[PDB]
Structures are given as C-alpha cells and as structure tokens.
PDB file of C-alpha atoms in Angstrom:
ATOM      1  CA  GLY A1045       0.254  -0.282   0.033  1.00 45.80           C
ATOM      2  CA  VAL A1046       3.141   2.500   0.717  1.00 45.11           C
ATOM      3  CA  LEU A1047       4.825   3.933  -2.198  1.00 42.00           C
ATOM      4  CA  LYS A1048       6.794   5.992  -0.908  1.00 43.75           C
ATOM      5  CA  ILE A1049       7.660   7.527   2.894  1.00 47.90           C
ATOM      6  CA  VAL A1050       9.428  10.685   3.671  1.00 43.79           C
ATOM      7  CA  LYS A1051      10.997  11.415   7.621  1.00 43.42           C
ATOM      8  CA  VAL A1052      11.682  14.911   8.250  1.00 39.17           C
ATOM      9  CA  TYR A1053      13.938  15.758  11.183  1.00 37.45           C
ATOM     10  CA  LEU A1054      14.062  18.407  13.835  1.00 36.16           C
ATOM     11  CA  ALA A1055      16.392  19.823  16.587  1.00 35.66           C
ATOM     12  CA  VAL A1056      15.151  22.122  19.281  1.00 36.41           C
ATOM     13  CA  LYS A1057      16.926  23.547  22.073  1.00 36.00           C
ATOM     14  CA  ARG A1058      15.349  23.501  25.140  1.00 37.20           C
ATOM     15  CA  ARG A1059      16.304  26.025  28.077  1.00 41.39           C
ATOM     16  CA  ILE A1060      15.462  25.124  31.658  1.00 42.31           C
ATOM     17  CA  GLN A1061      12.744  27.077  33.293  1.00 41.12           C
ATOM     18  CA  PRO A1062      10.315  27.240  35.893  1.00 41.78           C
ATOM     19  CA  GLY A1063       8.074  23.640  35.894  1.00 42.33           C
ATOM     20  CA  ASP A1064      11.840  21.632  34.747  1.00 41.51           C
ATOM     21  CA  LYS A1065      12.314  18.640  37.451  1.00 43.87           C
ATOM     22  CA  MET A1066      15.898  18.711  38.915  1.00 42.90           C
ATOM     23  CA  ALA A1067      17.881  16.914  41.372  1.00 41.61           C
ATOM     24  CA  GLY A1068      21.054  15.426  43.154  1.00 40.66           C
ATOM     25  CA  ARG A1069      22.022  12.160  43.425  1.00 39.88           C
ATOM     26  CA  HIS A1070      20.986  11.718  47.276  1.00 41.09           C
ATOM     27  CA  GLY A1071      17.804  11.157  46.351  1.00 39.95           C
ATOM     28  CA  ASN A1072      16.437  15.012  46.453  1.00 39.57           C
ATOM     29  CA  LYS A1073      13.849  15.940  44.135  1.00 40.89           C
ATOM     30  CA  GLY A1074      12.781  19.698  43.421  1.00 41.24           C
ATOM     31  CA  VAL A1075      11.121  21.544  40.713  1.00 40.94           C
ATOM     32  CA  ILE A1076      12.357  24.989  39.417  1.00 41.55           C
ATOM     33  CA  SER A1077       9.865  27.429  41.059  1.00 40.07           C
ATOM     34  CA  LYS A1078      11.837  30.809  39.822  1.00 41.24           C
ATOM     35  CA  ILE A1079      14.250  32.072  37.427  1.00 41.43           C
ATOM     36  CA  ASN A1080      16.007  34.755  39.732  1.00 39.46           C
ATOM     37  CA  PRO A1081      17.592  37.871  38.551  1.00 41.56           C
ATOM     38  CA  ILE A1082      21.377  37.561  38.867  1.00 41.14           C
ATOM     39  CA  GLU A1083      21.633  41.156  41.609  1.00 42.38           C
ATOM     40  CA  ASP A1084      18.822  38.859  43.678  1.00 39.75           C
ATOM     41  CA  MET A1085      20.991  35.980  44.056  1.00 43.98           C
ATOM     42  CA  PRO A1086      22.694  35.348  47.815  1.00 41.62           C
ATOM     43  CA  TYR A1087      26.361  36.493  46.977  1.00 43.52           C
ATOM     44  CA  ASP A1088      29.587  36.486  49.209  1.00 47.00           C
ATOM     45  CA  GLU A1089      31.825  39.005  50.698  1.00 43.14           C
ATOM     46  CA  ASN A1090      33.877  38.136  47.914  1.00 41.76           C
ATOM     47  CA  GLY A1091      30.961  39.668  45.162  1.00 41.13           C
ATOM     48  CA  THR A1092      30.566  35.680  43.726  1.00 43.57           C
ATOM     49  CA  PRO A1093      26.675  35.204  43.669  1.00 42.51           C
ATOM     50  CA  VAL A1094      25.112  31.992  44.465  1.00 44.92           C
TER      51      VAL A1094
ATOM     52  CA  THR B  13      20.196  68.949  56.850  1.00 42.48           C
ATOM     53  CA  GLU B  14      24.139  68.702  56.694  1.00 44.89           C
ATOM     54  CA  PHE B  15      24.878  67.740  53.233  1.00 39.38           C
ATOM     55  CA  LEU B  16      27.895  66.165  52.495  1.00 40.52           C
ATOM     56  CA  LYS B  17      29.173  64.595  48.966  1.00 42.56           C
ATOM     57  CA  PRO B  18      31.798  62.071  48.126  1.00 43.68           C
ATOM     58  CA  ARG B  19      34.270  62.687  45.565  1.00 42.79           C
ATOM     59  CA  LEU B  20      35.706  59.552  43.282  1.00 45.05           C
ATOM     60  CA  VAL B  21      39.189  59.636  45.243  1.00 45.00           C
ATOM     61  CA  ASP B  22      41.228  56.164  43.525  1.00 46.47           C
ATOM     62  CA  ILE B  23      40.544  54.295  40.932  1.00 47.75           C
ATOM     63  CA  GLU B  24      43.127  51.201  40.971  1.00 44.96           C
ATOM     64  CA  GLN B  25      42.930  49.515  37.638  1.00 41.30           C
ATOM     65  CA  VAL B  26      44.570  46.577  38.712  1.00 39.72           C
ATOM     66  CA  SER B  27      43.820  44.926  35.138  1.00 36.18           C
ATOM     67  CA  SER B  28      41.882  45.624  31.826  1.00 33.21           C
ATOM     68  CA  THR B  29      39.194  43.574  33.802  1.00 33.14           C
ATOM     69  CA  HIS B  30      39.247  44.216  37.089  1.00 34.73           C
ATOM     70  CA  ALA B  31      39.672  47.321  38.809  1.00 35.86           C
ATOM     71  CA  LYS B  32      39.280  48.911  42.617  1.00 35.24           C
ATOM     72  CA  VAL B  33      37.471  52.178  43.156  1.00 29.70           C
ATOM     73  CA  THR B  34      37.766  53.679  46.432  1.00 31.64           C
ATOM     74  CA  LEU B  35      35.430  56.359  47.027  1.00 31.56           C
ATOM     75  CA  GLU B  36      35.224  59.146  50.269  1.00 29.18           C
ATOM     76  CA  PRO B  37      34.131  60.450  52.234  1.00 27.35           C
ATOM     77  CA  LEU B  38      30.202  59.084  52.382  1.00 27.44           C
ATOM     78  CA  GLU B  39      28.502  59.959  55.327  1.00 25.13           C
ATOM     79  CA  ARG B  40      27.175  57.474  57.972  1.00 25.21           C
ATOM     80  CA  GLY B  41      24.643  54.648  56.089  1.00 27.11           C
ATOM     81  CA  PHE B  42      25.217  55.826  52.902  1.00 26.24           C
ATOM     82  CA  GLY B  43      27.747  53.035  52.753  1.00 26.93           C
ATOM     83  CA  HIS B  44      25.579  50.071  51.900  1.00 26.42           C
ATOM     84  CA  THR B  45      22.635  52.507  50.902  1.00 26.20           C
ATOM     85  CA  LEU B  46      25.218  53.132  47.388  1.00 26.84           C
ATOM     86  CA  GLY B  47      27.118  50.571  47.721  1.00 26.99           C
ATOM     87  CA  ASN B  48      24.163  47.944  47.308  1.00 29.44           C
ATOM     88  CA  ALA B  49      21.969  50.034  44.864  1.00 28.83           C
ATOM     89  CA  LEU B  50      24.966  50.690  42.630  1.00 27.79           C
ATOM     90  CA  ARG B  51      25.816  46.742  42.895  1.00 26.27           C
ATOM     91  CA  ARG B  52      22.194  45.928  41.271  1.00 24.57           C
ATOM     92  CA  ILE B  53      22.331  48.933  38.029  1.00 22.51           C
ATOM     93  CA  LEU B  54      26.230  47.853  37.329  1.00 22.63           C
ATOM     94  CA  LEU B  55      24.846  44.114  37.531  1.00 22.95           C
ATOM     95  CA  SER B  56      21.861  44.722  34.964  1.00 20.64           C
ATOM     96  CA  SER B  57      21.503  48.143  33.067  1.00 25.15           C
ATOM     97  CA  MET B  58      24.869  48.639  32.030  1.00 27.94           C
ATOM     98  CA  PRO B  59      25.364  48.467  28.097  1.00 30.64           C
ATOM     99  CA  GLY B  60      28.723  46.794  25.809  1.00 31.76           C
ATOM    100  CA  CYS B  61      28.570  45.184  22.541  1.00 30.84           C
ATOM    101  CA  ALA B  62      28.241  41.729  21.725  1.00 27.31           C
ATOM    102  CA  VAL B  63      27.745  38.946  18.856  1.00 29.24           C
ATOM    103  CA  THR B  64      24.171  38.727  17.324  1.00 31.50           C
ATOM    104  CA  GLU B  65      24.672  36.934  13.952  1.00 32.11           C
ATOM    105  CA  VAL B  66      26.925  34.467  12.318  1.00 31.75           C
ATOM    106  CA  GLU B  67      27.039  33.531   8.859  1.00 35.06           C
ATOM    107  CA  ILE B  68      29.723  30.970   7.695  1.00 35.36           C
ATOM    108  CA  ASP B  69      29.646  30.010   4.189  1.00 33.62           C
ATOM    109  CA  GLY B  70      28.922  26.333   3.814  1.00 34.97           C
ATOM    110  CA  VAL B  71      26.837  26.220   7.043  1.00 32.59           C
ATOM    111  CA  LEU B  72      23.167  25.665   7.012  1.00 35.58           C
ATOM    112  CA  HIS B  73      22.686  25.007  10.757  1.00 34.41           C
ATOM    113  CA  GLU B  74      24.428  25.232  13.823  1.00 37.20           C
ATOM    114  CA  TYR B  75      24.221  21.539  14.931  1.00 38.75           C
ATOM    115  CA  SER B  76      25.998  20.619  11.189  1.00 38.07           C
ATOM    116  CA  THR B  77      29.934  19.680  11.773  1.00 38.91           C
ATOM    117  CA  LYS B  78      32.132  21.523   8.993  1.00 38.04           C
ATOM    118  CA  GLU B  79      35.131  18.743   8.026  1.00 35.86           C
ATOM    119  CA  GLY B  80      38.911  19.919   8.964  1.00 35.59           C
ATOM    120  CA  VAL B  81      37.012  21.755  12.129  1.00 32.55           C
ATOM    121  CA  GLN B  82      38.122  20.249  15.367  1.00 32.42           C
ATOM    122  CA  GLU B  83      35.093  22.313  16.944  1.00 32.35           C
ATOM    123  CA  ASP B  84      31.607  21.472  15.766  1.00 32.10           C
ATOM    124  CA  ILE B  85      29.335  24.574  14.586  1.00 36.40           C
ATOM    125  CA  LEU B  86      27.549  25.138  17.889  1.00 38.58           C
ATOM    126  CA  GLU B  87      30.943  24.963  19.697  1.00 38.65           C
ATOM    127  CA  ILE B  88      32.123  27.732  17.868  1.00 38.64           C
ATOM    128  CA  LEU B  89      28.895  30.051  18.373  1.00 39.34           C
ATOM    129  CA  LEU B  90      29.207  29.707  22.126  1.00 40.20           C
ATOM    130  CA  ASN B  91      33.829  31.202  21.471  1.00 37.08           C
ATOM    131  CA  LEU B  92      32.123  33.898  19.681  1.00 37.33           C
ATOM    132  CA  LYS B  93      29.750  34.873  22.946  1.00 36.61           C
ATOM    133  CA  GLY B  94      32.613  35.719  24.887  1.00 34.36           C
ATOM    134  CA  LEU B  95      34.477  37.647  22.198  1.00 37.95           C
ATOM    135  CA  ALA B  96      35.443  40.555  23.761  1.00 36.05           C
ATOM    136  CA  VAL B  97      35.096  43.712  21.105  1.00 36.61           C
ATOM    137  CA  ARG B  98      35.198  47.618  21.443  1.00 35.63           C
ATOM    138  CA  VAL B  99      32.970  49.571  18.941  1.00 36.46           C
ATOM    139  CA  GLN B 100      33.856  53.088  18.770  1.00 32.30           C
ATOM    140  CA  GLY B 101      31.565  55.155  16.383  1.00 34.54           C
ATOM    141  CA  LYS B 102      28.723  52.681  15.048  1.00 34.90           C
ATOM    142  CA  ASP B 103      26.585  51.002  16.900  1.00 33.12           C
ATOM    143  CA  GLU B 104      26.494  47.737  14.284  1.00 34.39           C
ATOM    144  CA  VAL B 105      29.448  46.375  12.869  1.00 35.39           C
ATOM    145  CA  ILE B 106      30.071  43.505  10.799  1.00 36.14           C
ATOM    146  CA  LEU B 107      33.524  41.987  10.791  1.00 34.44           C
ATOM    147  CA  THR B 108      34.886  39.234   8.106  1.00 29.78           C
ATOM    148  CA  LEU B 109      36.698  36.318   9.161  1.00 30.54           C
ATOM    149  CA  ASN B 110      39.004  34.669   6.242  1.00 32.19           C
ATOM    150  CA  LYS B 111      41.520  32.211   7.735  1.00 29.54           C
ATOM    151  CA  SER B 112      43.618  29.040   6.351  1.00 30.93           C
ATOM    152  CA  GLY B 113      46.009  26.418   7.088  1.00 29.55           C
ATOM    153  CA  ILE B 114      46.639  24.382  10.139  1.00 26.95           C
ATOM    154  CA  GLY B 115      46.202  26.611  12.932  1.00 29.24           C
ATOM    155  CA  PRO B 116      44.432  27.812  16.328  1.00 26.84           C
ATOM    156  CA  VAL B 117      42.205  30.807  14.455  1.00 22.74           C
ATOM    157  CA  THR B 118      42.406  33.762  17.028  1.00 23.28           C
ATOM    158  CA  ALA B 119      40.824  36.679  17.727  1.00 21.93           C
ATOM    159  CA  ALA B 120      43.503  39.048  15.917  1.00 20.64           C
ATOM    160  CA  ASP B 121      42.465  36.895  12.463  1.00 21.31           C
ATOM    161  CA  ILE B 122      39.287  38.892  12.271  1.00 18.49           C
ATOM    162  CA  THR B 123      39.739  41.706   9.988  1.00 19.67           C
ATOM    163  CA  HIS B 124      39.366  44.887  12.671  1.00 18.40           C
ATOM    164  CA  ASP B 125      37.141  47.875  11.290  1.00 18.47           C
ATOM    165  CA  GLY B 126      38.829  51.345  11.619  1.00 20.56           C
ATOM    166  CA  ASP B 127      36.890  51.879  15.026  1.00 16.35           C
ATOM    167  CA  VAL B 128      36.698  48.097  15.910  1.00 15.98           C
ATOM    168  CA  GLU B 129      38.914  47.142  19.128  1.00 15.16           C
ATOM    169  CA  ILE B 130      39.428  43.288  19.461  1.00 14.82           C
ATOM    170  CA  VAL B 131      40.348  43.570  23.234  1.00 14.14           C
ATOM    171  CA  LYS B 132      41.328  39.655  23.559  1.00 16.97           C
ATOM    172  CA  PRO B 133      43.258  39.375  20.402  1.00 19.89           C
ATOM    173  CA  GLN B 134      44.565  35.863  21.338  1.00 19.26           C
ATOM    174  CA  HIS B 135      41.213  34.430  22.238  1.00 17.62           C
ATOM    175  CA  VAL B 136      40.089  31.352  20.738  1.00 14.97           C
ATOM    176  CA  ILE B 137      37.227  30.862  17.840  1.00 14.85           C
ATOM    177  CA  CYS B 138      38.046  27.738  16.371  1.00 14.73           C
ATOM    178  CA  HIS B 139      40.802  24.945  15.666  1.00 16.18           C
ATOM    179  CA  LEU B 140      41.757  24.395  11.577  1.00 19.73           C
ATOM    180  CA  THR B 141      43.449  20.782  11.570  1.00 12.72           C
ATOM    181  CA  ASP B 142      43.166  20.405   8.088  1.00 12.47           C
ATOM    182  CA  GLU B 143      46.132  22.750   5.966  1.00 14.72           C
ATOM    183  CA  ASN B 144      43.750  22.719   2.967  1.00 19.93           C
ATOM    184  CA  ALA B 145      40.628  23.599   5.264  1.00 21.77           C
ATOM    185  CA  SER B 146      39.646  27.468   4.724  1.00 22.86           C
ATOM    186  CA  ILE B 147      36.974  28.985   7.261  1.00 23.54           C
ATOM    187  CA  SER B 148      35.289  32.343   6.261  1.00 25.68           C
ATOM    188  CA  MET B 149      32.290  33.755   7.933  1.00 27.00           C
ATOM    189  CA  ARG B 150      30.909  37.073   9.265  1.00 26.64           C
ATOM    190  CA  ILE B 151      30.062  37.815  13.035  1.00 28.44           C
ATOM    191  CA  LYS B 152      27.694  40.315  13.416  1.00 26.20           C
ATOM    192  CA  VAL B 153      28.506  42.502  16.413  1.00 27.84           C
ATOM    193  CA  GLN B 154      25.367  44.756  18.097  1.00 29.67           C
ATOM    194  CA  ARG B 155      25.729  47.279  20.736  1.00 30.00           C
ATOM    195  CA  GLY B 156      22.637  46.680  23.476  1.00 28.54           C
ATOM    196  CA  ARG B 157      22.305  45.864  27.034  1.00 27.24           C
ATOM    197  CA  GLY B 158      21.684  42.865  29.681  1.00 24.93           C
ATOM    198  CA  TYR B 159      20.943  39.405  27.583  1.00 25.92           C
ATOM    199  CA  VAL B 160      18.916  39.290  24.760  1.00 27.59           C
ATOM    200  CA  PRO B 161      18.589  35.616  23.919  1.00 28.91           C
ATOM    201  CA  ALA B 162      18.001  34.103  20.138  1.00 31.05           C
ATOM    202  CA  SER B 163      14.400  32.691  21.338  1.00 30.49           C
ATOM    203  CA  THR B 164      13.305  35.751  22.620  1.00 30.50           C
ATOM    204  CA  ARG B 165      14.772  37.801  18.934  1.00 32.93           C
ATOM    205  CA  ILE B 166      13.158  34.769  16.949  1.00 34.30           C
ATOM    206  CA  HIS B 167      10.004  35.797  17.556  1.00 36.98           C
ATOM    207  CA  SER B 168       9.616  39.697  16.929  1.00 33.93           C
ATOM    208  CA  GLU B 169      10.702  41.038  14.119  1.00 37.83           C
ATOM    209  CA  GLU B 170      12.159  38.381  11.192  1.00 36.54           C
ATOM    210  CA  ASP B 171      10.561  40.522   8.139  1.00 37.12           C
ATOM    211  CA  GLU B 172      13.954  38.941   6.190  1.00 39.25           C
ATOM    212  CA  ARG B 173      14.495  35.487   7.058  1.00 35.43           C
ATOM    213  CA  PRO B 174      17.907  34.461   4.978  1.00 36.12           C
ATOM    214  CA  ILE B 175      18.812  30.560   5.494  1.00 33.10           C
ATOM    215  CA  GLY B 176      22.525  30.766   7.331  1.00 35.55           C
ATOM    216  CA  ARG B 177      22.319  33.641   9.810  1.00 39.25           C
ATOM    217  CA  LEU B 178      22.750  31.701  13.067  1.00 38.15           C
ATOM    218  CA  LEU B 179      21.098  33.734  16.149  1.00 38.44           C
ATOM    219  CA  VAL B 180      22.812  32.928  19.687  1.00 40.73           C
ATOM    220  CA  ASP B 181      23.192  33.976  22.660  1.00 38.61           C
ATOM    221  CA  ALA B 182      24.641  37.929  23.038  1.00 41.74           C
ATOM    222  CA  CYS B 183      25.183  38.740  26.659  1.00 44.32           C
ATOM    223  CA  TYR B 184      25.791  43.070  26.328  1.00 44.38           C
ATOM    224  CA  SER B 185      25.980  43.140  30.191  1.00 46.46           C
ATOM    225  CA  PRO B 186      30.107  43.582  30.528  1.00 45.95           C
ATOM    226  CA  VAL B 187      29.958  43.455  34.118  1.00 50.25           C
ATOM    227  CA  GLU B 188      30.806  39.913  35.187  1.00 51.19           C
ATOM    228  CA  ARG B 189      31.330  40.001  39.009  1.00 50.13           C
ATOM    229  CA  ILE B 190      30.833  43.655  41.820  1.00 45.80           C
ATOM    230  CA  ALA B 191      31.103  43.618  45.194  1.00 47.29           C
ATOM    231  CA  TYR B 192      31.588  46.983  47.469  1.00 49.72           C
ATOM    232  CA  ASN B 193      33.002  46.689  50.848  1.00 48.21           C
ATOM    233  CA  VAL B 194      33.312  49.177  53.623  1.00 44.04           C
ATOM    234  CA  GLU B 195      36.752  49.651  55.631  1.00 46.82           C
ATOM    235  CA  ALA B 196      37.032  52.767  58.209  1.00 48.14           C
ATOM    236  CA  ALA B 197      37.844  56.333  56.056  1.00 50.54           C
ATOM    237  CA  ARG B 198      40.062  58.041  59.288  1.00 51.58           C
ATOM    238  CA  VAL B 199      39.518  61.545  57.349  1.00 53.36           C
ATOM    239  CA  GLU B 200      39.792  64.592  59.872  1.00 52.03           C
ATOM    240  CA  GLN B 201      38.761  63.619  63.147  1.00 53.60           C
ATOM    241  CA  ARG B 202      35.167  62.503  62.344  1.00 55.14           C
ATOM    242  CA  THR B 203      36.236  58.942  62.306  1.00 53.41           C
ATOM    243  CA  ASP B 204      32.334  57.547  61.976  1.00 53.44           C
ATOM    244  CA  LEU B 205      32.747  58.641  57.999  1.00 54.63           C
ATOM    245  CA  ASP B 206      34.284  55.577  55.786  1.00 55.10           C
ATOM    246  CA  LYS B 207      34.756  54.809  52.109  1.00 55.80           C
ATOM    247  CA  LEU B 208      32.923  52.958  49.145  1.00 54.86           C
ATOM    248  CA  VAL B 209      35.988  50.770  47.636  1.00 49.05           C
ATOM    249  CA  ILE B 210      34.048  49.351  44.819  1.00 49.34           C
ATOM    250  CA  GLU B 211      35.504  45.667  43.419  1.00 52.16           C
ATOM    251  CA  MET B 212      34.447  45.448  39.307  1.00 54.01           C
ATOM    252  CA  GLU B 213      35.442  42.398  37.577  1.00 54.04           C
ATOM    253  CA  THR B 214      34.616  42.991  33.692  1.00 53.47           C
ATOM    254  CA  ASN B 215      35.030  41.831  30.266  1.00 53.02           C
ATOM    255  CA  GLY B 216      37.013  43.715  27.795  1.00 52.12           C
ATOM    256  CA  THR B 217      36.847  47.660  27.702  1.00 51.68           C
ATOM    257  CA  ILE B 218      34.074  48.935  29.311  1.00 52.37           C
ATOM    258  CA  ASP B 219      36.068  51.163  31.566  1.00 52.46           C
ATOM    259  CA  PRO B 220      35.601  51.241  35.176  1.00 53.63           C
ATOM    260  CA  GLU B 221      34.811  55.038  35.625  1.00 57.74           C
ATOM    261  CA  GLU B 222      32.831  55.192  32.816  1.00 58.43           C
ATOM    262  CA  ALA B 223      30.565  52.717  34.119  1.00 60.22           C
ATOM    263  CA  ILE B 224      30.555  54.277  37.483  1.00 60.09           C
ATOM    264  CA  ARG B 225      29.710  57.412  35.772  1.00 58.37           C
ATOM    265  CA  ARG B 226      26.464  55.825  33.934  1.00 60.32           C
ATOM    266  CA  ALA B 227      25.041  53.581  36.885  1.00 61.12           C
ATOM    267  CA  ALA B 228      25.133  56.792  38.776  1.00 62.33           C
ATOM    268  CA  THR B 229      23.332  58.666  35.770  1.00 62.66           C
ATOM    269  CA  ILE B 230      20.208  55.562  35.426  1.00 62.11           C
ATOM    270  CA  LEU B 231      19.765  56.549  39.613  1.00 61.58           C
ATOM    271  CA  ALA B 232      19.883  59.705  39.469  1.00 59.84           C
ATOM    272  CA  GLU B 233      17.364  59.432  36.070  1.00 57.92           C
ATOM    273  CA  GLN B 234      15.129  57.737  37.839  1.00 63.83           C
ATOM    274  CA  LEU B 235      15.050  59.629  40.702  1.00 63.95           C
ATOM    275  CA  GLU B 236      13.621  62.655  38.841  1.00 65.14           C
ATOM    276  CA  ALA B 237      10.172  60.594  39.051  1.00 62.36           C
ATOM    277  CA  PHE B 238      10.084  61.298  42.934  1.00 64.12           C
ATOM    278  CA  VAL B 239      11.841  64.677  42.832  1.00 62.40           C
ATOM    279  CA  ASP B 240       9.801  66.440  39.934  1.00 61.65           C
ATOM    280  CA  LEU B 241       6.208  64.310  39.918  1.00 62.03           C
ATOM    281  CA  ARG B 242       6.146  64.514  43.714  1.00 66.63           C
TER     282      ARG B 242
ATOM    283  CA  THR C  13      20.512  53.094  26.814  1.00 66.30           C
ATOM    284  CA  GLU C  14      16.822  52.611  26.272  1.00 69.45           C
ATOM    285  CA  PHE C  15      16.081  54.756  29.910  1.00 66.48           C
ATOM    286  CA  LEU C  16      12.452  53.483  30.855  1.00 67.56           C
ATOM    287  CA  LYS C  17      11.488  56.093  33.410  1.00 68.38           C
ATOM    288  CA  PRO C  18       8.854  55.286  36.212  1.00 70.83           C
ATOM    289  CA  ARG C  19       5.482  58.033  36.460  1.00 70.48           C
ATOM    290  CA  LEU C  20       4.037  58.362  40.499  1.00 76.00           C
ATOM    291  CA  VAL C  21       0.692  57.157  39.372  1.00 75.47           C
ATOM    292  CA  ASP C  22      -1.165  56.592  42.793  1.00 73.96           C
ATOM    293  CA  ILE C  23      -0.977  58.524  46.144  1.00 70.80           C
ATOM    294  CA  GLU C  24      -3.733  57.380  48.306  1.00 69.49           C
ATOM    295  CA  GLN C  25      -3.333  59.456  51.405  1.00 67.62           C
ATOM    296  CA  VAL C  26      -4.877  56.551  53.436  1.00 70.55           C
ATOM    297  CA  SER C  27      -4.755  59.443  56.695  1.00 68.83           C
ATOM    298  CA  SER C  28      -1.636  62.298  57.102  1.00 67.46           C
ATOM    299  CA  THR C  29      -0.061  60.187  59.171  1.00 66.44           C
ATOM    300  CA  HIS C  30      -0.151  56.923  56.376  1.00 62.22           C
ATOM    301  CA  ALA C  31       0.168  56.978  53.255  1.00 63.69           C
ATOM    302  CA  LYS C  32       0.377  54.574  50.266  1.00 64.23           C
ATOM    303  CA  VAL C  33       2.400  55.031  46.981  1.00 62.28           C
ATOM    304  CA  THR C  34       1.765  53.452  43.854  1.00 61.51           C
ATOM    305  CA  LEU C  35       4.796  53.595  41.332  1.00 61.06           C
ATOM    306  CA  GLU C  36       5.297  52.092  37.671  1.00 61.61           C
ATOM    307  CA  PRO C  37       6.359  50.921  35.753  1.00 64.48           C
ATOM    308  CA  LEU C  38       9.945  50.283  36.709  1.00 66.30           C
ATOM    309  CA  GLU C  39      12.655  48.063  34.624  1.00 62.11           C
ATOM    310  CA  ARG C  40      13.191  44.662  35.947  1.00 61.10           C
ATOM    311  CA  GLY C  41      15.623  44.967  39.643  1.00 62.83           C
ATOM    312  CA  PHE C  42      14.668  48.567  39.769  1.00 62.55           C
ATOM    313  CA  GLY C  43      11.767  47.967  41.809  1.00 61.27           C
ATOM    314  CA  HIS C  44      14.031  46.703  45.048  1.00 60.06           C
ATOM    315  CA  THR C  45      17.263  49.045  44.242  1.00 60.86           C
ATOM    316  CA  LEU C  46      14.865  51.972  44.538  1.00 58.55           C
ATOM    317  CA  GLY C  47      13.016  50.449  47.463  1.00 57.92           C
ATOM    318  CA  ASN C  48      15.700  49.650  49.641  1.00 57.63           C
ATOM    319  CA  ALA C  49      17.735  52.764  48.973  1.00 56.96           C
ATOM    320  CA  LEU C  50      14.885  55.085  49.973  1.00 56.78           C
ATOM    321  CA  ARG C  51      13.595  53.222  52.934  1.00 56.79           C
ATOM    322  CA  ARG C  52      17.141  53.237  54.261  1.00 57.34           C
ATOM    323  CA  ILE C  53      17.518  57.342  53.672  1.00 58.83           C
ATOM    324  CA  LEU C  54      13.899  57.689  55.042  1.00 56.37           C
ATOM    325  CA  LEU C  55      14.156  56.261  58.212  1.00 58.26           C
ATOM    326  CA  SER C  56      17.982  56.504  59.051  1.00 61.57           C
ATOM    327  CA  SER C  57      18.696  60.008  57.144  1.00 62.91           C
ATOM    328  CA  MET C  58      15.893  61.980  57.369  1.00 61.91           C
ATOM    329  CA  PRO C  59      16.559  64.777  59.791  1.00 62.19           C
ATOM    330  CA  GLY C  60      14.238  66.442  62.494  1.00 63.81           C
ATOM    331  CA  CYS C  61      14.060  67.478  66.212  1.00 63.35           C
TER     332      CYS C  61
END
C-alpha cells in the first residue's frame, strides 16, 4: 500500500525554566519555581553570587 | 541638613578586567545605601557590545559539522559569545574572518574595522586541523544591554529570514562580578565616615570610571520621577 | 541606553500620617533598587527634632 515515505528530523534547543524537574544524587528532587535575576541572588563577601 | 557629597578618589586598575575604586567621604550609612543600589544597576542595566548574528559559508545550521574543523558549529558560536569587542563609532558592525591552514584561529585573525578594537586578540574561536581547510564567516556585533537570547529574537521582527544566519545568545552586559566593601576612612576627626571600595570585574573595555558614571546616571534619572513628580 | 522612567501613579493618602504610593512602570530589579535605597534614607537620614 505504501508508495513512498519522507522522514523529517527536527532539532530543538530547550533551556531550563520553571516547572522543569531537577535533582542531586542523594534522592533530593525539586521543581524550579523561579528564575531570579543575578542582582537578587545571595552573594558572598567576595562578590560571587550563588 | 548637614549635606556631604563624596568624590571619586582612587581608580586602581589592577587589570583591564579587574578594577578597585575607592570613594570618600560618605556620611554614615550611605556606604551600604549607595553600595548596594549601585551594585544592582551595575549588574543589570550596563550597556556593552556582543555577537548577535553569525554567517559561516557552507553552514546551513548550528548543529552541523564543518570538515577540517575540530569544533562543531555550536562550540564555535559559544566562543563568539565570549568574544571581547569594543566598537567606537557605530552601534552595529559586521566583521569578516577569512583564515586557512593548520592553525588555532584567534580573535586577531578577524579583519579589524577602523573603529573596532578586539580586546583579547589571543581569544580562541576555532581549531583548523586540515591545512587545505579554509573558514570564512561574517560576525555581526551589535551594541545593547543585559541578556538578549536568540529565542526572544526569533519571535519579534523577522521580515527578512535568510537561510544561513545563526542567532545565538549575546550577554551585552559587560559586568562579570561586582562587590562593594566598607572600611574605616580616618579623615579629619570624623572617624564614623568610612569609604566605598567597589571591586569591579568586567569583560574587555567598558572603562571602570565610565561605567560608574553611567550607573549613577541611571539612578539619578529614576529619582527624577520621585523629585519632579512629587 | 533605552532609559525607561517610572511615573508617580497613585497617592492614596489614607491619613495625613499614613500614605500608600504606587509607582510604575519600573524596569526589572529597579523595584528593590529604589525601594530599599529610599527606605534607608527615609528611616536613618531624614532630619528632625
């Protein structure tokens, strides 16, 4: 029945956003709630932000 | 009212990237007031230059591989995001890079425009392995501010949609790191009055003094709305 | 620089002592930048008897 078949391969670049699921290796799960601006992130005395 | 304005004292440019800036005298409590408010603007609002568009001949998309090249096209794009460029006159410049032979392609191999300064000429862009391999590309550098992703730029204009132009992230914002320390001033016999030492770490160019001027400018422009309009 | 300035929108003077003030629009992060800087001067630095 099938005379010819055309296969398209699409590529997609997906960046992290709220609702994506992240975890460590100690069975600590979590869902991203918010992406904070770098200005708002807790930072140390040296100036380097978390 | 015992009004007392600070004055820019020392600009210790330890490196073109790293600079310390001491600031005195500041009345008690204004050290942290100005320190933090400035830090926030300095991280976000600051303008700079970044690669917005790339066009390599014989490249249809960023996921393909070019022959005679160690790096995949994506790897190359990521290197151009980190390319340090100063544009003096125009806000938009297209630089051309034609290079061949068995060489790690550096930033110096780009044909420099009259008013376009490559701040880190040794910056790696691509590794040519085959001697017969030649690479030719047009790097579009625009001036802007903050972080403008290609995903937010592929859903606005797009009147001309030329197959070959690759859109990638370009963090225009020059400021990499900033921290403000507060130490004793020991001026006349005031004692309490301290000093504002702001340690900045930026990419190429944006001048430390110039950046502080712009940051304070943006702050004072916003204060117009609370002074002029009540 | 595409300087986006805020405009004083509402002054709800609930009493001569208490007043609410809405302010918009402010570019991202300028809410806390202006918010806190002002709060500090308003508390420690406003002079009186």
